[PDB]
Each structure stands twice: as C-alpha cells, then as structure tokens.
Amino acid sequence: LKNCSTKEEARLLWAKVQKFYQKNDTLDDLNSVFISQSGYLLQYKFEYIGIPERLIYTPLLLIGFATLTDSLHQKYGGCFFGPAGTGKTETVKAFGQNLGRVVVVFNCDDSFDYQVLSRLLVGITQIGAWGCFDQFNRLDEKVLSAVSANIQQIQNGLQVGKSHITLLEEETPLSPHTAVFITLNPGYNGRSELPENLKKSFREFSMKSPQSGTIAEMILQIMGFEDSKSLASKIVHFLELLSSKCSSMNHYHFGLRTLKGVLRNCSPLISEFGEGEKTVVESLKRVILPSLGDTDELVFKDELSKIFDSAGTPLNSKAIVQCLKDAGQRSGFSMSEEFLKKCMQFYYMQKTQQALILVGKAGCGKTATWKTVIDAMAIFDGHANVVYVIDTKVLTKESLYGSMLKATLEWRDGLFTSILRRVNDDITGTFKNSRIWVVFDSDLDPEYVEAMNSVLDDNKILTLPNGERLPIPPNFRILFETDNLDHTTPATITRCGLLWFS
Amino acid sequence: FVIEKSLNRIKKFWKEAQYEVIEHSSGLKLVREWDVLEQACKEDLEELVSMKASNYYKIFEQDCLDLESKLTKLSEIQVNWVEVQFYWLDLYGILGENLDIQNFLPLETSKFKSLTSEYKMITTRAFQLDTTIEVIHIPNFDTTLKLTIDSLKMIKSSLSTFLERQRRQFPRFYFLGNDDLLKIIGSGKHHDQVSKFMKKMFGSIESIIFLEDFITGVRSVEGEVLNLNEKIELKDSIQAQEWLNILDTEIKLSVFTQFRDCLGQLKDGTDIEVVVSKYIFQAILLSAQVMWTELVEKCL
Amino acid sequence: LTRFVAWLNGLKIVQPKIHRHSNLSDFDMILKKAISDCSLKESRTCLIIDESNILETAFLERMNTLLANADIPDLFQGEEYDKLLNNLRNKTRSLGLLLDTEQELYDWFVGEIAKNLHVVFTICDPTNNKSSAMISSPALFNRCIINWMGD
Amino acid sequence: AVPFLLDPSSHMITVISNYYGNKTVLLSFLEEGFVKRLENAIRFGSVVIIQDGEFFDPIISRLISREFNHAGNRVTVEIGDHEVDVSGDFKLFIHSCDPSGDIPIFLRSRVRLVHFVTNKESIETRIFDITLTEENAEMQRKREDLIKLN
Amino acid sequence: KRVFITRVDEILWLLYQEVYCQFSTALDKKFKMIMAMTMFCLYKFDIESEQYKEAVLTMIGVLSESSDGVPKLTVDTNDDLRYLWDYVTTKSYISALNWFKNEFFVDEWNIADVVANSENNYFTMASERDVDGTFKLIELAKASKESLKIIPLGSIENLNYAQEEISKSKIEGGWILLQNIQMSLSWVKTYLHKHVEETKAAEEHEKFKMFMTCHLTGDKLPAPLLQRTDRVVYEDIPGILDTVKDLWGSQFFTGKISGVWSVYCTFLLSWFHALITARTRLVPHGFSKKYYFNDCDFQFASVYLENVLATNSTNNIPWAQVRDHIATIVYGGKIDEEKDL
Amino acid sequence: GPPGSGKTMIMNNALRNSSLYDVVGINFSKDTTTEHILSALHRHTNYVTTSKGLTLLPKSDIKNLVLFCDEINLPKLDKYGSQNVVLFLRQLMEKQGFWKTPENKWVTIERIHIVGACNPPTDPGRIPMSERFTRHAAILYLGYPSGKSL
Ligand SMILES: Nc1ncnc2c1ncn2[C@@H]1O[C@H](COP(=O)(O)OP(=O)(O)OP(=O)(O)O)[C@@H](O)[C@H]1O
Ligand SMILES: N#Cc1c(C2(c3ccc(Cl)cc3)CC2)nn2c(O)c(Oc3cccc(Br)c3)cnc12
Ligand SMILES: [Mg+2]
C-alpha cells in the first residue's frame, strides 16, 4: 500500500484484502464480527479451532479465497481442479480457519463405503458445517453417481432456501450455513471433470502453483530481511543460470522445492554467521555443491562469484579433518583430498536432515565414506552408532512395512517399522545416546518411498496403512545408498540430501 | 437303471446328516458351518427335478416324489433357521449384556429374553434328535422360526429409531456411528470414556479436563488448555446429550469471552508478549486483525 | 500315440485333470501324487502334459525345476520331508537295503525318480507365446528329445 | 460332431428350444454350478445347450472328443473323476455370442463351427431381390412358382 | 426402397442421391463434406476414365499435403473441372469443399424435412455445448401447430414429473423435449430405455412425437436406444450481432432497478460475452484450446457489476477493479493456460 | 560361456574328487523366487541362534558348500529393471547374510560359497546383470574345445 501511486491503486488493493469489521450495535455477540472482501460479507462463527498450521500468504492464496467467497455470495458450491501438490484442501481448511470453522474432510474410495458418507452428509447438513470432498475423481461410478445426486439435492436446497430436504428418503432440516467444496485431481484424458448434473451448480477454478521470487522474498523476510528483494532476485537468477549452463541431468532439480530446502538450511546457519548474504552462499554450497558433478562444480563456482561473492574460508576445517584421518588410518584407507572433501561434505550435510541419498557408480567408495564418517563422529562426539543394513528390494513392501492378514486384524510390524518401534519404545539401552543409521542399500522406486512419504515431509512421521503415526526422533537417520535415481521423484529428491560421487 | 443307483446314494447321504454344534457363553448352543448341508440339499433338489426327464422312471417315481417333498421342506426350514441364528447373535452383543441399555429399553429386552428361552428349547430339542433330516418331523418348526425372525426384525427396527432420534437431538452424533454411540449411552455414568470420541465429533479438541466435580475446560490436539467461564455441573440424573449440548454452547461463549477480553486489553495499549501467555491463539488473532484493519482504515 | 506306446511298455499314464479353476496347489497335489507313485510304488508313469494345461507360468517353472533335477523341493518341505524320510526308511528297509543319513536316502529317491518318470510335452502351435516360452526354456530344451510331428 | 452356433443375434437358442421342447436344458460356462448339472444332464439324456462359448472348461473335452471307456452292459465317460454313464439320447450344443471371442484350438479343430452372424454381403443377395420386385413382379413370380409347382 | 418411388445408369445415380439425401442429416458438417467427396469419388471413378481419377487424386493431394503435383488438367475437360484447381490456386477452401456438394444437386434436408418425412416418434438431436436445438423446435413445433413440452431433467422429483408427463403426453399426443438427457442417463437406462426401446402400437404413432436433447462431447448413449431413435445434429451457428440482440433481449424481462449506468454496463457486458463466444469456436487460433462458456458467467458478472455499482459513486474509478475481477474470477476461472488468460 | 562349454562338468569334476566342497545345483528360469533358493538350502543346511551373530546358518556338517546357481541372468526383472534375486545373491556375497522377514531377524551365512554360470548376455532373452553384483565375482570365459580336442 505504501508503494502505490495514489488512492486509486490503494483502494483497488484494499478491496481484495480481507477486512474484519465488528458491529457495535449488535447485542448478538456471536454475530458481531463479519468479514468483507471485494464487497461481499461473511459472518464469523465462533467455533474453537485450537492451534492450526498456517499457510504462507501468497497472491494465489488470496485469489482462491476470492473465488470461494464469490461462489458463496451466490450460494453456489465451490470446486477447483488442478495438478496435485498445489494445496487445494489446505486452502479450503485455511479458509475455514479464517472464519472460525472446522472443515470436515471426507476421504473417498480408500475402501470407503457409501453408507457412512450419507450419514456424514446428513450430519453436516444439520450442523451447518463445511464439507470438502478431497480428490473427488477417484470414485466408483455407482458411488460417484449416488453421492453426486445427494450433493445436487444439498446445493439446490441452498439456492432455493428450503428448510427441510429429503435425503436418503429421510426428511431433515437444512441449515443455511452449510457449504460443500470439491477438489479435483488431474485427469488422464486431460484434466478431470465433474459429472454433468453438477456443472450448473458449481464454479470451477484452475488452481496451480506459484512462481518463485515472491515466496523467496517472504521466507527471507522471515529469516532476517536485510536485503530481501535483492537476495531473492539473486537466488532466482542464480538457479536459472545454473539450470542454463549445467548439463541436463536427470536428478538435477532446481525448482522451488530446492530453494525452500536451501532456505530451510539457511535458517539454522544464520545462528552461526548472521542474517547476511554470506549465510546464503554457505547454504548453497552445502546443499547444491554435493549434488553437482565435477563438470558442474566449476560452473557453480563461476556463476556464484559472478552474481555475488561473499566469503572465502569455512569453519570446522581441522578437528573433523583430524578425526577423519584417524578413522581412515584405522580402516587402512588413504586420505585422498577427494575422499576427505566428500567425508567433510557428508558430515556437514547430515547435521540438518535425516534422509540422505548417496549416488555413484558401483565401487565409488560410498559405503567406506559413510562408515568412516560415522566412526569419526563416534570419536569426536562420543556418541555410539548402531547400524542396520536392509537390501530393501529383496523384501516386499509387506515384509518391510506392515499389512493386514486374511481376516484377523493382528498387525505384522514389518522390518522397518519394527526397528523404529524398538528405536522409540525401548527405553532401555543407549539409543538416545546413539546415532541410529538405517541403510536402504538398493535401487529405490516410487511405490516404496510413497508408502513412507510423510517421513520426507516436514511431518517427519512414518505413516502406516494401520492408521498409526510413528514420530521419528533426531537420532534416527536414513541412507538410501544406490546407483541411480531414474525412478525417484523430484518431490523426494528435494526432501533428501543428495550426494553425487562424480 | 441308474435312477435307483442315484436314489440309493441320496438316501444314504441323508441318513448321515450331522450338524456341528458348539455352545457359546450363555446356555444356548450355536450351529457352525451352515453352507455344506444347505448346498447338498439344493444339489439333491436339482437332481430330483432332473429325474423327471428320464424314461425309465414312470413307475419308479412315487418314492422320488416323497423324497422331493421332504427335501423341499428341509430347505424351507434351512433358510429361516440360519436367518434366526444370525439376527439373534447380533442383537445379543447389544442387549443381552449391558444393564444400562436395557434399562433405557425395557420392552425390547423383555421380549428378547422371552424369545431366547423358546429358542433354547427348539435348539436343544433339535440337536438331540441326532439326525438333521428328522428335524422336519419336529412339530412347529417352520412357523416357529418364521415368527421368531419376525420378532427379531421388529426388535431391530425398534433398536434403530431410538438411535436416530438421539442423533436428532445432538447432530454431532452423526459422525460417531452406532457402536460408539452405544458405548456413550451405556457409559454415561462413568464420564471419562466419552473423551476418546471427542476428537471425532469435534475435530479440534482432544480431551476434556475434569476437576472430579465439574468440567473446567478442554484441551486441544496441540496441547493448549481452554478454561471455561461457566463450569458444567454433573449429577446422577443426567443424560450425555444434556451436558454435551451445554458444553457445546459454553465453549463458544467462552471463546467469545476471551476474544472480547483480548480486544479490550489490546485496545488498552498492551504488549502482545504479555497477552500471548494468557489468552488463546484464536482470540489474539482476531483481535489483532480487527485492530490492524481499524488502524489501516484511517491510515488509508 | 503316446498312450499307445506307454501301454506297450506297461507304463502307467497320467494326464492332469485341470480346468478353469485348478490352481497351483492342485497341480502340486497332482505332482506329489505322481512322484509318490513313481518312487514308492515304482509305477513308471508317463506324465503327458499339453501346453493348454500350463495356464499360468508357475506350472512351467515347476516343470523346469523337475526336468532340471529330479524333484521339487517345495513339494517335500518341512514336516513333509520328515514324513517322506520315514516312508523312505521304511521303503528301503522293506527292500532290505539300509541307508542311515538323509542324504543317502534322498540320493536313492532322486535316482529312482530319474529312472521311473517320463515326461512328454505335446505342443499344438509353436508360434504361440506360451509354446515359444516352453521351447525356449533351457531346463526343458536341454533335456527333452525334441521331435517334430509337424504336418 | 458338436455344432458351434456363432450367432451374436440371440435367436438360435430359441429355435432349438422350440424344436426340442421341454427337454432342452440351458447351461453356461459362467454358471458355477455347471459341472455337476451337466454331469447330471448327460446321465439323464437331456438335450443341452451351453451359452458363452468364448470360454471353455477342459473337463468337458471327453464329450467333444468322443471317447467313452467301453463297458459291456453300459458306456461310461470320465468327466473328471466322475465315471458317468451316457444315456444315449444326450445331445450337446455349444453357442457363442461374438466372433471376437477366441476359440481354444482344441475345440476349434473338433467342433463344427457355423455362423448365423448377419453379413453385409446379404445386401448383395437381397437388394437384387427387391430390385426385381420393382422391376418385374411377374418374372420374380415365375422364378418361384416354377420350382414350387414342380 | 425409396429409390423407385441405361436403367442401371439412372437407378444407380438416383441411389447416390438418395443416400446423401437421407444419411447426411445425422452427421456434422465435417463428416458431411467427407461423405460428399468420398461418395463422389466412388461414383466417378467407375464411370469416367483413369485420367479423371488421376486428376482428382492429385487435386485431393494438393488440398491435403500427401503429394503435391500440378499435372495437365485433362484435354477439353476445363468445363467439367478446372474450377477446383482455380480454387486451389487462389488457396480458397470453402468453395472447393462445397463444389462436391453443389455437384449432388440434392436439396439438403432440413430438420423440418426429416421430421415431416420420417414416420417415427423418437428423435435425438445431439449438439455441441455452443448451441441448443430448442429454439429450432420452438419455430418448428409452432409451424406444425403441435405443442412443445420442455421437461428439464433435474432432481428425483423432476424425474418423476418427467415420467408422469411422458406417460400422459403420449396419450394426449403433444410433443415433448427432454433437455440434457446425458446427466440422467442412469435413470434413462432403468426406465426410459425399456420405455421407448420397444415399439408398442399405432396409438402413439398417430399423435405422439418425442424429442431428446443430447451432447456430442460427453458420455455414450446405449446402443439399442440410440439405434431405435432417429438421429439429428443441430449445427446452426448464429451470428455475432444476432447473439448480441439475443442477449440484450433477455435483459428487460426481469428489469433493471439499480440505475441508468447499470444499463450501460450491461450493454458492455453483452458485447464482451458475444466476442468471447465468437472467439470460442476458433480452437487452433485464438484460444489455445476449446473452453466452454455459459450464461452463468454472464450472471456472475452481472451480479458483480450491480454490487460494485450499488455501493460506489458515479465516478469513472471502478473500471480499475472490475476488469481484473472478470478476467480472473468470472471468466478466468476455467482457463488454466496463462496465454488464454 | 556358450551353451555346452563344459561349464558344469569342470566344477563337478574338480569338486567330486574333493571331500571338502559339496555342491547344490539350482537351475534358474524366467521366474525363480528367493523362496526357491531358501527351500533348496533347507535340505542341506541348519540354523543356530547366537546373540553375537543373530541367526547363523551353517551347513549341516563339517564340509564347505557350493551353490551352483546356473542360468543366473534369466530371472525376469520388473519394469524398473530390478531383478530381486540377483540382488539377494549380491547380499549373500557382500553382506554374508540376509533378513528373515517372518522373524525380522538377521541371518549370517557360514561357509557357503556362490558359483554362477551363465550364457553370454548377447544371446536371445538374456538380461544384463547389475555391475554392483558382478563386481564381486571372478568372471571366467570358457569356449568350445577347438574341434581337435573333441
Ligand atoms: N579411502 C580409501 N582409501 C583407499 N582405498 C579405498 C578408499 N575408499 C575405498 N577404497 C577402495 O575402493 C573399493 C570400493 O568402494 P566400496 O567398497 O565402498 O564400493 P561402493 O562405492 O560402496 O560401491 P557399491 O555401489 O558397489 O556398493 C573399496 O573396497 C576399497 O578397496
Ligand atoms: N558328458 C558331457 C559333456 C561334455 C562332453 C565333454 C567335453 C569335454 C570333456 Cl573333457 C569331456 C566331455 C561330451 C562332450 N560337454 N558338456 C558340457 O559342455 C556341459 O556344459 C553345460 C553345463 C551346464 C549348462 C550348459 Br548350457 C552347458 C555339460 N555336460 C557336457
Ligand atoms: Mg556400497
């Protein structure tokens, strides 16, 4: 608002921003505060929400809020399609939290029947809560047709305003406050679409993902702002120029995921140096450098020194070097400068992440590397190291993760979950005083890492088909030792530390 | 011809019909593995029907007609008996055990026990005949089972309208389901077991805090404790729906109370750091939003 | 012709009675029966198989294991091995030759199979993918006297 | 020889039944009680028609490839382990609903394949018959009255 | 059978004329020109010489991009041809594609001609979402002096009222329309399929006629139901100015109560909607892909205009925020490609 | 080596004379499983529990045991190219053990040796094995014995 020319752009901007007003003459306390945006009004409900997670405010988030309030102004059901990973339900839940509402999410087709869905619809139609159909396209045609019929009855009762509606051949009152939202995953013939009966009652939105300069500036504002705009511009230009000159490799991922990782790695490093550009340079050299090849390390250095030159000499250059040399001597290894460099690199990388990926040719020395670093840590820190090595693709997912039996519910833990149980519940042994290294030494694929995706996410939780979440402690770190990433997603790569043995 | 060779094996099979019987907790004995005998019955019926297309059976028929007339009624009693078995075993785990649920519904259980006695009579008498085919000679068995499943169906229909009306009183119960609501109604006296379901029927909060006399407040899934303004009284002659509805309105009024209190403090030139340690997150968020838009309106 | 020549040699004939629902477990019972007859009864069975019978590849893998060796270990696993061992002890001792350790009897067993089991594959159209897999299988190829009864 | 009636236009399964009357049993490879009832039917000597031919159940092979271990007094067939006596008067028909259904080579080389499938080349047969019906009614009358009066 | 009411040389040509006269109505314009050119080739290749075949094949390969050659036209065949070649050298495609149609010398059967000529009670006119065949039925049923029920297929009550009106209207004999049968297809296969699949008697043939509105892009209709009914494709595209008058005519029914400036804003919205709709049909050029726009967008844009005008002074200022609101919320909602945005 | 280059005969002769190295033969195909390998091993091997070595698998005697795993490069890989049995054999050499997944405990192998045999990867239907596996073995080539020696 400060950078506007006159009052015209200021009022244009202010129309889009959510305004929270209060009624002084209400005497109807629960209805005092209302929310105005672009001319439309919305009554605040005083529903307890606790401490929910807050999304980063971005222009596209406010555009999604504007589409929801625009559809609700005319009592129309809200729905938006787009590629997965753009935060459709997170946007809807954040929209509900902003008005003090708890959006009840309905997970569908995950062996999800239709009886309980109709029971939830009648209950949400009585309470007046807001329901969101997460990923509505993945449904069976008979269940999708019957549920779409029920949604049609609800929306028609809202548009007309009938107090009582016939649902499930049951007469039931309809509170006017209910609203339904439909998120749609991307189709396979194109983008997925709604059934024909629902097209004349919903408003479809094209929901995607944002660019990078603005989000970069915002995160930099969080960490310490000094020169937020210039640093964000320089980082984006540097990543573009890296993608420009570096060779086209499969595992190269310079997208927004990569820069969010670089900024999350910059956050604890500011505590070491300060809220300057030097911290950004060091984070980039900690994350990006180990993933680049010999041919591309000099490209990185050149472009780095080109766009911005910051510092010259790093910290922790000698005690760890000594412990490493001792470890290599105990193993009888020759402490080549490349081996030393990679050991130190790996040592620094593992400090701020739990999922490590080490890639190279067969015989590169990667296993010697990580074991030597582990022994060096055991000397320097005085903590123990417990190591488990699992050649995971010999095992099935069911033998690794759990499963269900024929009819008995009894849960087979599976190897990786059973060891994680032992790492947490034990409370006998020095696992809290140990580093725990679980090595998944094999070629990795989408299916297995998908079954454990929430561990790579900021959740740092192992989610199980059994419905339980296992929080991983800081002691627990994971190494995917392999030789290729061909069938690995960027989504996973950007959550892990990648080390390319060139 | 082969007609005799088949009737012989049929009769041989049917003079060896035995039922696996095993007795559950209470006195009655349940029958296991229905499908074998029923499938044999149906198979033999289709064979007896097909015996009508032969040519060497005209004089050889009457015996097979008696056999058919026997097996048809056997299947008739088969169907009704398995249905009675299943429905009684389902209503038993709901009514035959708890005292509170039958105190709420005295009539239906009063009928349930009267049905269980007769069913015990029939089953014991039927098992002790030691030949599954001879059961059809036991008097009043088809009509018995017919009226028994009719009575069970009536009980089960009754058993659901009371729950639906309970859902109509408190619409959050729609999220719970039949099983959980049954435990809430039976365990309303103890009062602590309801707390496990509170995350399901609310979504925000986790557990309810007690002071052994009243409800001081509830805590969320994150761990933040909420203190109520008005404490909820508890007595002996109370239902779960009553104190649950009072709790439902009270938490909304307490949220508004801390919100206007927060806004009043923030209007009175206070620090955000002192307020955060005292008021909930949602109140300080809304009060901050109101004051922010209020100061920016004149700043515009 | 195979039945005829088996009859001439006084062999027992076996033809698996498999249909639209027979599975690996059933074909396993067939083979355990056959092998027990060939060994314990010494019955000298010509087991005739047609490509139509191998409606899944598990049957073909088993036949590879059979002709490559003279046994299927999976058929005689666990407690069934111990039972089998008892029977063989009895069998051998019924014939008056005595062997003590498991290896000796298992060698005897396998040799008796290796001389008392004759497997014959008919294949109607070689260009079918299943037929092509049977011809190309090395365990089959390096044992079967391939003969063309073409047209 | 077992006829194999390939008619997508379902109709044959009615004309056959109208011919043989009450003794026409109808069966299917997808009716999972099939095997025992078929065994029963051949013991009785019923006529049988089997639906859904683009499926086969190899146990029936001994009906198709005629074989019956001869006995003196009787005549018996192993339909699996069931050593069933043939009642002589038995007749098997197979039917099938679509030519895109594959016929197992075992069947396809024993069974008499016949098609009732509507053929476009009936245009070629029939439109001349209507062309002459509008060209010369008397000569198309002669074309039929000659042979029928003969 | 219709062909009857050098004998071969006549009846063959009249058969080609009858086939194109009857089956073209059930096809869209593109397949109409495909059938016209093809059938013309099947007739002319057997009668005329090979030189005629070679000339037509090379001209089709110049219309396409298979093989481009410019042979001699033929000798003294300039009157018979050289006109498509003349259209080729000028790079004009509409006249060249319609020349094969003008060659048939067949009065192109209108929907009125097929409904009058054929003796059937069921007709389905499927069409794209761009247009609707209802307005054609308004004039056609009024010209036939029947009536025209428009039974919308909405909820279960609408379905019950639909089957009730069907079972009564067939007895009364009035014409009915079933708009958007595709959405209630699940109800169709249960009831409507069995209802109209099998013919009953001449009681319904004398009076009753039924129409069904379908959409080409969408779910597939059942084969016996589709084969039982006659098929038409309403492909009449109105003009831009005509759509402006059609949108402007609908505005004064409900009336405008906000102000005189809202009338001017509505006029601007009508022009905007007609121009986007005009650009909608051009898929390769213009919009990147084909986006469907309905009148609901007109409604939401109109309500946003009344809301901003009811709360704002008569200055020229709100034109800053109305434009983005329309291009990002009202109309930019369906669009995913930024170029089309 | 090519098919018929005395690949097995040499092993069998070398070890038959020897009293130390007994042989198990495992002839692979298109879809062999790791369970087949363990079922083969079960007849010759024994399992002992120890805290230090978890589940040791010695052979059931004092000798050494050679697993002659013939045709090791045929097991059909998945669409990602992973042939799990070759990775299992890599585990047996490189790690001297494997995981027992019904028990979820580690197994250390005692004295068991691995011998592969293969027909060159250029022949029809052969799969290129992983270098990570093959790196552990002393590969040799055998060829047909010059004609004259035959
Ligand atoms: N620091 C060192 N000094 C001397 N030699 C080394 C050193 N590191 C590794 N080597 C040699 O390189 C060999 C191969 O490396 P390593 O055994 O770690 O294989 P790897 O890189 O883990 O490959 P794979 O992907 O096949 O597991 C080692 O066996 C060792 O002989
Ligand atoms: N008897 C015999 C036999 C011989 C002969 C031989 C040659 C040299 C000598 Cl000094 C003595 C004998 C008799 C010609 N070669 N030969 C093989 O090459 C075999 O090679 C294999 C093994 C497994 C898989 C595949 Br594929 C091929 C297997 N057996 C034999
Ligand atoms: Mg390694």
PDB file of N, CA, C and O in Angstrom, chain E residues 276-301:
ATOM      1  N   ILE E 276     -16.222 -12.995 -26.731  1.00  0.00           N
ATOM      2  CA  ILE E 276     -15.529 -14.177 -26.240  1.00  0.00           C
ATOM      3  C   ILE E 276     -16.148 -15.419 -26.843  1.00  0.00           C
ATOM      4  O   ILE E 276     -15.439 -16.327 -27.291  1.00  0.00           O
ATOM      5  N   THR E 277     -17.478 -15.456 -26.912  1.00  0.00           N
ATOM      6  CA  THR E 277     -18.150 -16.590 -27.516  1.00  0.00           C
ATOM      7  C   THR E 277     -17.810 -16.705 -28.995  1.00  0.00           C
ATOM      8  O   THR E 277     -17.723 -17.814 -29.525  1.00  0.00           O
ATOM      9  N   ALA E 278     -17.562 -15.578 -29.659  1.00  0.00           N
ATOM     10  CA  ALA E 278     -17.166 -15.632 -31.057  1.00  0.00           C
ATOM     11  C   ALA E 278     -15.764 -16.192 -31.183  1.00  0.00           C
ATOM     12  O   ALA E 278     -15.465 -16.940 -32.117  1.00  0.00           O
ATOM     13  N   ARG E 279     -14.910 -15.878 -30.227  1.00  0.00           N
ATOM     14  CA  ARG E 279     -13.555 -16.395 -30.271  1.00  0.00           C
ATOM     15  C   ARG E 279     -13.488 -17.831 -29.796  1.00  0.00           C
ATOM     16  O   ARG E 279     -12.502 -18.520 -30.066  1.00  0.00           O
ATOM     17  N   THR E 280     -14.523 -18.294 -29.111  1.00  0.00           N
ATOM     18  CA  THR E 280     -14.519 -19.656 -28.601  1.00  0.00           C
ATOM     19  C   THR E 280     -14.453 -20.707 -29.695  1.00  0.00           C
ATOM     20  O   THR E 280     -13.722 -21.694 -29.557  1.00  0.00           O
ATOM     21  N   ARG E 281     -15.176 -20.510 -30.796  1.00  0.00           N
ATOM     22  CA  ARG E 281     -15.238 -21.555 -31.815  1.00  0.00           C
ATOM     23  C   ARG E 281     -13.899 -21.809 -32.486  1.00  0.00           C
ATOM     24  O   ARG E 281     -13.598 -22.948 -32.850  1.00  0.00           O
ATOM     25  N   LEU E 282     -13.082 -20.781 -32.632  1.00  0.00           N
ATOM     26  CA  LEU E 282     -11.777 -20.908 -33.272  1.00  0.00           C
ATOM     27  C   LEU E 282     -10.770 -21.536 -32.316  1.00  0.00           C
ATOM     28  O   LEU E 282     -10.136 -20.854 -31.518  1.00  0.00           O
ATOM     29  N   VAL E 283     -10.620 -22.852 -32.378  1.00  0.00           N
ATOM     30  CA  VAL E 283      -9.748 -23.547 -31.430  1.00  0.00           C
ATOM     31  C   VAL E 283      -8.245 -23.465 -31.726  1.00  0.00           C
ATOM     32  O   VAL E 283      -7.477 -23.243 -30.790  1.00  0.00           O
ATOM     33  N   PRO E 284      -7.737 -23.737 -32.935  1.00  0.00           N
ATOM     34  CA  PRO E 284      -6.276 -23.650 -33.115  1.00  0.00           C
ATOM     35  C   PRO E 284      -5.719 -22.243 -33.017  1.00  0.00           C
ATOM     36  O   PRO E 284      -4.604 -22.061 -32.522  1.00  0.00           O
ATOM     37  N   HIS E 285      -6.480 -21.245 -33.441  1.00  0.00           N
ATOM     38  CA  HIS E 285      -6.060 -19.852 -33.460  1.00  0.00           C
ATOM     39  C   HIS E 285      -6.999 -19.058 -32.578  1.00  0.00           C
ATOM     40  O   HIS E 285      -8.218 -19.173 -32.709  1.00  0.00           O
ATOM     41  N   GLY E 286      -6.444 -18.233 -31.708  1.00  0.00           N
ATOM     42  CA  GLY E 286      -7.338 -17.554 -30.808  1.00  0.00           C
ATOM     43  C   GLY E 286      -7.126 -18.129 -29.430  1.00  0.00           C
ATOM     44  O   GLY E 286      -6.100 -17.882 -28.796  1.00  0.00           O
ATOM     45  N   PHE E 287      -8.080 -18.905 -28.958  1.00  0.00           N
ATOM     46  CA  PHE E 287      -7.927 -19.582 -27.688  1.00  0.00           C
ATOM     47  C   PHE E 287      -7.040 -20.793 -27.900  1.00  0.00           C
ATOM     48  O   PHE E 287      -7.005 -21.328 -29.001  1.00  0.00           O
ATOM     49  N   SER E 288      -6.189 -21.113 -26.919  1.00  0.00           N
ATOM     50  CA  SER E 288      -5.270 -22.234 -27.123  1.00  0.00           C
ATOM     51  C   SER E 288      -6.026 -23.545 -27.277  1.00  0.00           C
ATOM     52  O   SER E 288      -5.685 -24.370 -28.132  1.00  0.00           O
ATOM     53  N   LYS E 289      -7.054 -23.757 -26.463  1.00  0.00           N
ATOM     54  CA  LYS E 289      -7.857 -24.962 -26.548  1.00  0.00           C
ATOM     55  C   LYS E 289      -9.307 -24.515 -26.464  1.00  0.00           C
ATOM     56  O   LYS E 289      -9.586 -23.323 -26.317  1.00  0.00           O
ATOM     57  N   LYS E 290     -10.249 -25.448 -26.538  1.00  0.00           N
ATOM     58  CA  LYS E 290     -11.652 -25.051 -26.575  1.00  0.00           C
ATOM     59  C   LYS E 290     -12.237 -24.989 -25.171  1.00  0.00           C
ATOM     60  O   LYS E 290     -12.387 -26.019 -24.510  1.00  0.00           O
ATOM     61  N   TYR E 291     -12.551 -23.786 -24.717  1.00  0.00           N
ATOM     62  CA  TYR E 291     -13.179 -23.551 -23.426  1.00  0.00           C
ATOM     63  C   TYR E 291     -14.667 -23.284 -23.608  1.00  0.00           C
ATOM     64  O   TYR E 291     -15.056 -22.546 -24.510  1.00  0.00           O
ATOM     65  N   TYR E 292     -15.502 -23.893 -22.778  1.00  0.00           N
ATOM     66  CA  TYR E 292     -16.944 -23.757 -22.918  1.00  0.00           C
ATOM     67  C   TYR E 292     -17.404 -22.660 -21.971  1.00  0.00           C
ATOM     68  O   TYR E 292     -17.059 -22.684 -20.791  1.00  0.00           O
ATOM     69  N   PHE E 293     -18.182 -21.708 -22.473  1.00  0.00           N
ATOM     70  CA  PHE E 293     -18.693 -20.613 -21.656  1.00  0.00           C
ATOM     71  C   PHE E 293     -20.209 -20.573 -21.683  1.00  0.00           C
ATOM     72  O   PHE E 293     -20.810 -20.547 -22.757  1.00  0.00           O
ATOM     73  N   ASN E 294     -20.819 -20.504 -20.519  1.00  0.00           N
ATOM     74  CA  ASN E 294     -22.262 -20.484 -20.427  1.00  0.00           C
ATOM     75  C   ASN E 294     -22.744 -19.120 -19.986  1.00  0.00           C
ATOM     76  O   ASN E 294     -21.968 -18.182 -19.837  1.00  0.00           O
ATOM     77  N   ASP E 295     -24.056 -19.021 -19.802  1.00  0.00           N
ATOM     78  CA  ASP E 295     -24.710 -17.825 -19.297  1.00  0.00           C
ATOM     79  C   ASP E 295     -24.533 -17.617 -17.801  1.00  0.00           C
ATOM     80  O   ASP E 295     -24.868 -16.536 -17.298  1.00  0.00           O
ATOM     81  N   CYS E 296     -24.025 -18.615 -17.081  1.00  0.00           N
ATOM     82  CA  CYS E 296     -23.772 -18.432 -15.659  1.00  0.00           C
ATOM     83  C   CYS E 296     -22.671 -17.417 -15.459  1.00  0.00           C
ATOM     84  O   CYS E 296     -22.684 -16.665 -14.483  1.00  0.00           O
ATOM     85  N   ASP E 297     -21.744 -17.357 -16.400  1.00  0.00           N
ATOM     86  CA  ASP E 297     -20.706 -16.357 -16.335  1.00  0.00           C
ATOM     87  C   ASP E 297     -21.287 -14.987 -16.567  1.00  0.00           C
ATOM     88  O   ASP E 297     -20.882 -14.018 -15.918  1.00  0.00           O
ATOM     89  N   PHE E 298     -22.317 -14.918 -17.392  1.00  0.00           N
ATOM     90  CA  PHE E 298     -22.988 -13.654 -17.596  1.00  0.00           C
ATOM     91  C   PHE E 298     -23.714 -13.243 -16.337  1.00  0.00           C
ATOM     92  O   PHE E 298     -23.691 -12.068 -15.957  1.00  0.00           O
ATOM     93  N   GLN E 299     -24.274 -14.214 -15.630  1.00  0.00           N
ATOM     94  CA  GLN E 299     -24.986 -13.904 -14.399  1.00  0.00           C
ATOM     95  C   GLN E 299     -24.039 -13.417 -13.307  1.00  0.00           C
ATOM     96  O   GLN E 299     -24.307 -12.407 -12.645  1.00  0.00           O
ATOM     97  N   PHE E 300     -22.926 -14.122 -13.113  1.00  0.00           N
ATOM     98  CA  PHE E 300     -21.966 -13.725 -12.089  1.00  0.00           C
ATOM     99  C   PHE E 300     -21.306 -12.403 -12.411  1.00  0.00           C
ATOM    100  O   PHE E 300     -21.079 -11.588 -11.506  1.00  0.00           O
ATOM    101  N   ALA E 301     -21.116 -12.106 -13.681  1.00  0.00           N
ATOM    102  CA  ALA E 301     -20.517 -10.827 -13.984  1.00  0.00           C
ATOM    103  C   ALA E 301     -21.532  -9.727 -13.775  1.00  0.00           C
ATOM    104  O   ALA E 301     -21.192  -8.651 -13.267  1.00  0.00           O
TER     105      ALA E 301
END
